[PDB]
């Protein structure tokens, strides 16, 4: 993926996560936990769903056309009828092949981007209280109980409240 999050600096996925696409996992004084990020997950899902709908609800009508199977040999005219249909068929087959190729490649990069967005959204929240360990995990340099972590996930985390405590641990 272009963003190197998924199948990148984040070793692997979580099969235990079944209620979300992206989420957090901690290990604080109170033990360890796991919660899915609805906001993030929905954003990916909403985009991929639109992507899908631009390709499914659509087909055109064609009634009276040209024959495409023949019981007798005829020559010139028939050759043209077959060439035309065959030419048509390859052009569309090409289009289909290229559509999924492009779409999929973009779908993989998008999901990867959304993961990275969450990581960045988190890093910025934590400010100077945490450090990126390089594996998708942040080392919060201050006692952070379940409540403290929850505020992070729900985005209400107040970095000042812990800055001092944190700065001391970081630079001592």
């Amino acid at each position: 993926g272009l963003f190197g999050a998924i199948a990148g600096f984040i070793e692997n996925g979580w099969e235990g996560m079944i209620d979300g696409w992206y989420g957090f996992r901690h290990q604080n004084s109170e033990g360890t936990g796991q919660a899915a990020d609805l906001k993030s997950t929905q954003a990916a899902i909403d985009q991929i769903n639109r992507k899908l709908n631009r390709v499914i609800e659509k087909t055109n009508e064609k009634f009276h056309q040209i024959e495409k199977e023949f019981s007798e040999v005829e020559g010139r005219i028939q050759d043209l009828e077959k060439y035309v249909e065959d030419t048509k068929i390859d052009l569309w087959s090409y289009n289909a092949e290229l559509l999924v190729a492009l779409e999929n490649q973009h779908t993989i990069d998008l999901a990867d981007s959304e993961m990275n967005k969450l990581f960045e959204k988190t890093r910025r929240q934590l400010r100077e209280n945490a450090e990126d360990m390089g594996n998708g995990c942040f080392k919060i340099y201050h006692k952070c109980d379940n409540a403290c972590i929850e505020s992070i996930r729900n985005g209400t985390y107040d970095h000042d409240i812990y800055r001092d405590e944190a700065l001391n641990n970081r630079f001592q």
């Binding site: 993926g1 998924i6 199948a7 984040i10 692997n12 996925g13 979580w14 099969e15 996560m17 079944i18 979300g20 696409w21 992206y22 989420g23 957090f24 996992r25 901690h26 604080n28 004084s29 990916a44 991929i48 899908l52 390709v55 499914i56 087909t59 009508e61 064609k62 009634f63 009276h64 495409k68 068929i89 569309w92 087959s93 289909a96 092949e97 559509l99 999924v100 190729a101 492009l102 779409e103 999929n104 490649q105 779908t107 993989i108 999901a111 993961m115 990581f119 988190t122 945490a130 360990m133 998708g136 995990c137 942040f138 080392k139 919060i140 340099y141 006692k143 952070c144 403290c148 641990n169």
Partner: protein, 318 residues
């Protein structure tokens, strides 16, 4: 003292392989099929007015082959010709058969309007044992086999004006005797001639005598032609022998009618898209059932499967 918060994404037990720009094989958590590849095997009797030829080709129905009289004036969104259909009337031959089958199929109707004959001097309703109509010798319902009357075949010259507001489809023919004796015996003149014209067109056909393989006992044949008379124009048939007269005309409409060759059973259901393999759902963008299709249908493509990714890349865990 310190805490650890890890960000991640999910993965699934068994993912789905998909193709991208940098991989012909890569696994994602979820995907959906874009190629409709299966059929129920039946043709839904509707949105589309469907008509089963059963044993009649659209042409034989048009001409009026006896066992096809049940189709008289039938209409259709989609005519379905069966592979076991057969012809059992008088041996015929149509130059540009394909074109006629096409323009009629497209018209989607067999509405026939009998018009005032005007055959003075000849014997009408000629028939053949090759076209048995019950116990008797019959002929195409929509055609009039003319023969000599009292040792003479007049120099026919009939006119039929098109005073309506729609185009008329006249379909006539000319008969090819098997021998000279037959020729003179049936039409007196040793050489027949049929000329059907309008102010816009004119086609003159000459009979041709000779022996041809027996078909239901007949060595002779009938070559069939057609003429479209536009509103304001008029039809003129001039012949001194061998003419197989029209009995009227077929109304010509434009629409979404068409024809298809298929042995698929016509069940009771609802399917927008019809193929010779049966009906198929049109929720996918592409289909691999058949290139022949009628209605709202996915485009046909060679590929039997195309997966559209619908989830992130699936990364397991050791």
């Amino acid at each position: 003292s310190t805490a650890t918060l890890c960000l991640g994404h999910h993965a699934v037990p068994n993912g789905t392989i998909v193709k991208t720009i940098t991989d012909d094989q890569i696994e994602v958590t979820n995907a959906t099929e874009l190629v409709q590849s299966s059929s129920t095997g039946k043709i839904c009797n509707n949105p589309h007015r469907i008509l089963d030829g059963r044993a009649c080709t659209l042409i034989d129905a048009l001409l009026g082959d006896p066992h096809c009289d049940v189709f008289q004036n039938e209409t259709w969104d989609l005519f379905v010709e069966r592979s076991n259909a057969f012809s059992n009337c008088y041996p015929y031959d149509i130059p540009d058969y394909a074109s006629l089958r096409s323009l009629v199929a497209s018209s989607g109707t067999l509405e026939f309007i009998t018009e005032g004959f005007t055959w003075t001097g000849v014997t009408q309703n000629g028939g053949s044992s090759a076209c048995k109509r019950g116990p008797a010798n019959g002929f195409f319902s929509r055609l009039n086999w003319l023969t000599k009357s009292e040792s003479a075949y007049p120099v026919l010259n009939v006119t039929m004006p098109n005073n309506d507001n729609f185009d008329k489809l006249y379909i006539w023919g000319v008969h090819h005797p098997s021998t000279n004796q037959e020729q003179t015996n049936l039409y007196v003149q040793a050489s027949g001639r049929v000329t059907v014209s309008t102010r816009r067109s004119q086609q003159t056909i000459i009979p041709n005598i000779g022996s041809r393989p027996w078909v239901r006992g007949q060595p002779g044949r009938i070559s069939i032609y057609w003429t479209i008379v536009k509103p304001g124009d008029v039809l003129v048939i001039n012949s001194n022998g061998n003419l197989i007269a029209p009995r009227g005309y077929f109304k010509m409409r434009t629409g979404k009618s068409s024809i298809m060759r298929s042995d698929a059973p016509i069940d009771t259901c609802i399917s927008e898209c019809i193929t010779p393999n049966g009906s198929i759902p049109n929720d996918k963008p592409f289909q691999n059932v058949n290139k022949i299709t009628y209605g709202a249908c996915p485009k046909y493509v060679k590929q039997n499967t195309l997966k559209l990714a619908t989830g992130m890349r699936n990364v397991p865990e050791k």
